[PDB]
Curated annotation (Swiss-Prot):
Subunit structure: Interacts with EAF2. Associates with UBR5 and forms a transcription regulatory complex made of CDK9, Pol II, UBR5 and TCEA1/TFIIS. Part of TBP-based Pol II pre-initiation complex (PIC), in which Pol II core assembles with general transcription factors and other specific initiation factors including GTF2E1, GTF2E2, GTF2F1, GTF2F2, TCEA1, ERCC2, ERCC3, GTF2H2, GTF2H3, GTF2H4, GTF2H5, GTF2A1, GTF2A2, GTF2B and TBP; this large multi-subunit PIC complex mediates DNA unwinding and targets Pol II core to the transcription start site where the first phosphodiester bond forms.
Portion held of the full protein: 1 to 79 of 301
One GO molecular-function entry: DNA binding
Placement of covalent cross-link Glycyl lysine isopeptide (Lys-Gly) (interchain with G-Cter in ubiquitin): K55
The protein, known as: Transcription elongation factor A protein 1
Source taxonomy: Eukaryota, Metazoa, Chordata, Craniata, Vertebrata
Modified residues (N-acetylmethionine): M1
Predominant subcellular localization, coarse grouping: nucleus
Record's disease association: A chromosomal aberration involving TCEA1 may be a cause of salivary gland pleiomorphic adenomas (PA) [181030]. Pleiomorphic adenomas are the most common benign epithelial tumors of the salivary gland. Translocation t(3;8)(p21;q12) with PLAG1.
């Protein structure tokens, strides 16, 4: 589970660098199936990648998926026990 997310982060990073993240859609849909934990988010930093991809999205589905991912992930970060 964790390395797969690290893989997505490294893949996504190249898309923001290329100023076209339309293709990130699939990588974002993949993340939607993984039970993300706060612990995983600290190690993977995937939330930062997805937030950047949300700006470089171009396709509305990508922005929508990234927006949906971060919506769930927020509670993990907003969880002070």
């Amino acid at each position: 589970m964790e390395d797969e997310v690290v893989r997505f982060a490294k893949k996504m990073d190249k898309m923001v660098q290329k100023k076209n993240a339309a293709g990130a859609l699939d990588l974002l849909k993949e993340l939607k199936n993984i039970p993300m934990t706060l612990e995983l988010l600290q190690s993977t930093r995937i939330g930062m990648s997805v937030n950047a991809i949300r700006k470089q999205s171009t396709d509305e589905e990508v922005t929508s998926l990234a927006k949906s991912l971060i919506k769930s992930w927020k509670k993990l970060l907003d969880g002070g026990s």
